[PDB]
Design a protein around this ligand. Structure first.
Ligand SMILES: CN1CCN2c3c(cccc31)[C@@H]1CN(CCCC(=O)c3ccc(F)cc3)CC[C@@H]12
Ligand SMILES: CC(C)CCC[C@@H](C)[C@H]1CC[C@H]2[C@@H]3CC=C4C[C@@H](O)CC[C@]4(C)[C@H]3CC[C@]12C
Ligand SMILES: CC(C)CCC[C@@H](C)[C@H]1CC[C@H]2[C@@H]3CC=C4C[C@@H](O)CC[C@]4(C)[C@H]3CC[C@]12C
Ligand SMILES: CC(C)CCC[C@@H](C)[C@H]1CC[C@H]2[C@@H]3CC=C4C[C@@H](O)CC[C@]4(C)[C@H]3CC[C@]12C
Ligand SMILES: CC(C)CCC[C@@H](C)[C@H]1CC[C@H]2[C@@H]3CC=C4C[C@@H](O)CC[C@]4(C)[C@H]3CC[C@]12C
Ligand SMILES: CCCCCCCC/C=C\CCCCCCCC(=O)OC[C@H](O)CO
Ligand SMILES: CCCCCCCC/C=C\CCCCCCCC(=O)OC[C@H](O)CO
Ligand SMILES: CCCCCCCC/C=C\CCCCCCCC(=O)OC[C@H](O)CO
Ligand SMILES: CCCCCCCC/C=C\CCCCCCCC(=O)OC[C@H](O)CO
Ligand SMILES: CCCCCCCC/C=C\CCCCCCCC(=O)OC[C@H](O)CO
Ligand SMILES: CCCCCCCC/C=C\CCCCCCCC(=O)OC[C@H](O)CO
Ligand SMILES: CCCCCCCC/C=C\CCCCCCCC(=O)OC[C@H](O)CO
Ligand SMILES: CCCCCCCC/C=C\CCCCCCCC(=O)OC[C@H](O)CO
Ligand SMILES: CCCCCCCC/C=C\CCCCCCCC(=O)OC[C@H](O)CO
Ligand SMILES: [Mg+2]
Length: 360
């Protein structure tokens, strides 16, 4: 049933090549660059493996169906295995994004490891293997579940409805909530730090203008409390407090000037740590946004088709969905570009590997 009228097959092969190339560069950058050895970038590498296996195993079979007028050319029991691999890789992807969002949030609230990251990644893959499992279990026993007019697709309306809910809308919702609370957490952490900075800076000025021990002691006690809210400084403040208690006003004032170097060092370090987390959250927010928006047409159209079953042209719906599948496959090529545009470490690593300089 081969059709030679397929300029679409040129555009799909581009999407396969951008997907495989981009994701190998992500996989090599997390493998080789120490500056990317962290839990977030381990999940982004697992995401890249899911994208790479879509480009090798799922996307070329999808191109093969376009060439034969969406008439399944492979043996008939490979249809349910193809859909299984297709739904598993993308389900693993949305639970990866949702695992990154939740991990970052929990990491702020619990301020206190490769193995912990690999436990979570492996848990996300097992969760996606088990939830996607009804597709081959029922679809290999009943062709009517994975075939409509000799097209291979998920043909049971109930798998599409229940599947979209448990594998798209629920983890999207968890992703959206945990991302929003992460942005509020980080704004509050930046805000509490600035408040602590004002209290420390103002008290240092009081100690500087002090003529009496009581003023220095009151200011240093207030400084100690602020330091606890944000240690090495707390001990240094206690030494300055001891001088003030024994009436050594001048000596305590000098010790307070010594505190300034410790205060400035910590403030700048914790303050540039928080703006690193905020920038990281923004890039993840582009990844998150582009994964949902690119898959939204396919899911919403497919839910509209179930709702207006009798009333709507299923031939036009099936044509649009075929297009909409490829907007979703194009997302497999976007994550590496996003990292090039907004992460210098990824841009630098990609630049060397393309030049085949694999040495650190
Ligand atoms: C008309 N028609 C075209 C062919 N196509 C098709 C399917 C079902 C019904 C109708 C179909 C199949 C779906 N496949 C994409 C699955 C996306 C997914 O599982 C997922 C999970 C979680 C996510 F967060 C985001 C995406 C593309 C290939 C098949
Ligand atoms: C499948 C293949 C295609 C390209 C491959 C990668 C190419 C190069 C490297 C760098 C090496 O240091 C570790 C393995 C790693 C990361 C490979 C892992 C497996 C891989 C992703
Ligand atoms: C079952 C198939 C489909 C996917 C299974 C996922 C496995 C193979 C993947 C997902 C995430 C991956 C890890 C992600 C991070 C790192 C650290 C890096 O410096 C070297 C590779 C290493 C150690 C990877 C090893 C393999 C890994 C655990
Ligand atoms: C995750 C949950 C949410 C919905 C669940 C499915 C809902 C209904 C059925 C049909 C039943 O006959 C076998 C289990 C099966 C296939 C469930 C498997 C586990 C499942 C996918
Ligand atoms: C929400 C955004 C991001 C994209 C989603 C697009 C969805 C909601 C819209 C866009 C165009 C729409 C289609 C336009 C016209 C027709 C022809 C009619 O006989 C059957 C329904 C059908 C096929 C519509 C179904 C819903 C549809 C697919
Ligand atoms: C985003 C980048 C991917 C671009 C396009 C892929 C779209 C593929 C669309 C293929 C056209 C449909 C077709 O040729 O098949 C219809 C056929 O008549 C039914 O039997
Ligand atoms: C994870 C679970 C899914 C994996 C394996 C299930 C069985 C795979 C079946 C593949 C059949 C391949 C084949 O050749 O099909 C025989 C027949 O000729 C076709 O019509
Ligand atoms: C909500 C569920 C998120 C994905 C499941 C999972 O295993 O997440 C690992 C861990 O919860 C992340 O810190
Ligand atoms: C095939 C075998 C694997 C499948 C089953 C594996 C399940 C492991 C789940 C979690 C590990 C991570 C927990 C350890 C990390 C400590 C930090 C912490 O507080 O995490 C708790 C949670 O993230 C906030 O509620
Ligand atoms: C949470 C992680 C795993 C979730 C679901 C696993 C089970 C998926 C469902 C697998 C099909 C169950 C089955 O074997 O059903 C037999 C049927 O009644 C006769 O064909
Ligand atoms: C005796 C045989 C009866 C067989 C059962 C018939 C009725 C059960 C309905 C749904 C099953 C579970 C579906 C949810 C999980 C599988 C689908 C999935 O993961 O999602 C697909 C994808 O997300 C969508 O585009
Ligand atoms: C629609 C999908 C939204 C994906 C999350 C990315 C984003 O920017 O959302 C902001 C959030 O809704 C508010 O904090
Ligand atoms: C291949 C598609 C285009 C890839 C171009 C990515 C490189 C790029 O645009 O990086 C410069 C940018 O101004 C960030 O510094
Ligand atoms: C499609 C994106 C594929 C990933 C883009 C990888 C090529 C970008 C690159 O390596 O550019 C380095 C340079 O420093 C930039 O200004
Ligand atoms: Mg003030």
């Amino acid at each position: 049933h081969l059709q030679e009228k397929n300029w679409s097959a040129l555009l799909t092969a581009v999407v396969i090549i951008l997907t495989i190339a981009g994701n190998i560069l992500v996989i090599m950058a997390v493998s080789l660059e120490k500056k990317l050895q962290n839990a977030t970038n381990y999940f982004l590498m697992s995401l890249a493996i899911a994208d790479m296996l879509l480009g090798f195993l799922v996307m070329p079979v999808s191109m093969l169906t376009i060439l034969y007028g969406y008439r399944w050319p492979l043996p008939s029991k490979l249809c349910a295995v193809w859909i299984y691999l297709d739904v598993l890789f993308s389900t693993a992807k949305i639970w990866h994004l949702c695992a990154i969002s939740l991990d970052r949030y929990v990491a702020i609230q619990n301020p206190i490891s490769r193995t912990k990251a690999f436990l979570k990644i492996i848990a996300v893959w097992t969760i996606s293997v088990g939830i996607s499992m009804p597709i081959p279990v029922f679809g290999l026993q009943d062709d009517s579940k994975v075939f409509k007019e000799g097209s291979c697709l998920l043909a049971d309306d109930n798998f599409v409805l229940i599947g979209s809910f448990v594998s798209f809308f629920i983890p999207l919702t968890i992703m959206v909530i945990t991302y929003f609370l992460t942005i509020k957490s980080l704004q509050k952490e930046a805000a509490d730090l600035e408040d602590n900075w004002e209290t420390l800076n103002d008290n240092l000025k009081v100690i500087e203008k002090a003529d009496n021990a009581a003023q220095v002691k009151d200011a240093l006690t207030k400084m100690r409390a602020a330091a606890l809210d944000a240690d090495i400084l707390v001990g240094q403040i206690d030494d300055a407090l001891k001088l003030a208690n024994e009436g050594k006003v001048k000596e305590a004032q000098a010790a307070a000037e010594q505190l300034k170097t410790t205060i400035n060092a910590y403030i700048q370090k914790y303050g540039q740590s928080i703006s690193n987390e905020q920038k990281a959250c923004k890039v993840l927010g582009i990844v998150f946004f582009l994964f949902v928006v690119m898959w939204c047409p396919f899911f919403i159209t497919n839910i509209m088709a179930v709702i207006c079953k009798e009333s709507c042209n299923e031939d036009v719906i099936g044509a649009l969905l075929n297009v909409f599948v490829w907007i979703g496959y194009l997302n497999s090529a976007v994550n590496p570009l996003v990292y090039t545009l907004f992460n210098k470490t990824y841009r630098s690593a990609f630049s060397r590997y393309i030049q085949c300089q694999y040495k650190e």
